[PDB]
């Protein structure tokens, strides 16, 4: 069902601190190598009045290198696909909720992304655009009440040698009843903006991910 080379199509509609936007994406990935890249364009609401870095993790865990010894929930969820809901809790009270419904049509994944942020302080690094990047992290994967869940404790690097801490919780649900849940495991990952224009209206994004048993 999943080919060594797959395409990505994306539309995100969201609002952060009452600021509405629509952002489209076009990309390619190697599901078996755990690599994806995409070109993003802001279609409405630009130039965004907040850090682009808070949207980047909302822009498909099907593009993770899984070893044989861990059940790959994400490749086995296709062709029907799966959804996730995610909460982002920042140290300064900022909160985001994001959801994605992922379908596959031939060699292409379609992503319907929604993103909602609120309670970011006007003087904070997100609304002042002082964020530099996400630090690489490890996702902890386990089952909570019959639902595959993942936790990430990570941080944004800010200008002036400071970090801005964020906790992620994500839940993942296959469209097909019957897709067996995996055992607990880890996913190492890195996300990078490879290129951008002046106000981040056009952005090239890269992600690489590897699943392991922590040895």
From TrEMBL:
Keyword Cell division: no
InterPro entries attached to this UniProt entry: GFP (IPR009017), GFP-related (IPR011584), Green_fluorescent_prot (IPR000786)
Lineage top rank: taxon: Eukaryota
Pfam family, one: GFP
Phenylalanine amide: residues bearing it: 59
Keywords carried by this UniProt record: Chromophore, Luminescence, Photoprotein
Modified residues (Cysteine sulfenic acid (-SOH)): 166
Coiled coil start-end: none
Protein name as catalogued: Green to red photoconvertible GFP-like protein EosFP
Cited Gene3D superfamilies: 3.30.1300.40, Green fluorescent protein
Family designation: Belongs to the GFP family.
GO biological process: bioluminescence; generation of precursor metabolites and energy
């Amino acid at each position: 069902a999943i080919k060594p080379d797959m395409k990505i199509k994306l539309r995100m509609e969201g609002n952060v601190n009452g600021h509405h936007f629509v952002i489209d994406g076009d990309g390619t990935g190697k599901p078996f190598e755990g690599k994806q890249s995409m070109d993003l364009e802001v279609k409405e609401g630009g130039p965004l009045p907040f850090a682009f870095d808070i949207l980047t993790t909302a822009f498909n865990r099907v593009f993770a290198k899984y070893p044989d010894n861990i059940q790959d929930y994400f490749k086995q969820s296709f062709p029907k696909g799966y959804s996730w809901e995610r909460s982002l809790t920042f140290e300064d009270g900022g909160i985001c909720n994001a959801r994605n419904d992922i379908t596959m049509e031939g060699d292409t994944f379609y992503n319907k992304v929604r993103f909602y942020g609120t309670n970011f302080p006007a003087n904070g690094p997100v609304m002042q655009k002082k964020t530099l990047k996400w630090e690489p992290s490890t996702e902890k994967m386990y089952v909570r009440d019959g639902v595959l869940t993942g936790d990430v404790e990570t941080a944004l690097l800010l200008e002036g040698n400071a970090h801005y801490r964020c906790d992620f919780r994500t839940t993942y649900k296959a469209k097909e009843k019957g897709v067996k849940l995996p055992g607990a495991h880890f996913v190492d990952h890195c996300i990078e903006i490879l290129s951008h224009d002046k106000d981040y209206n056009k952005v090239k994004l890269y992600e690489h991910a590897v699943a392991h048993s922590g040895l």
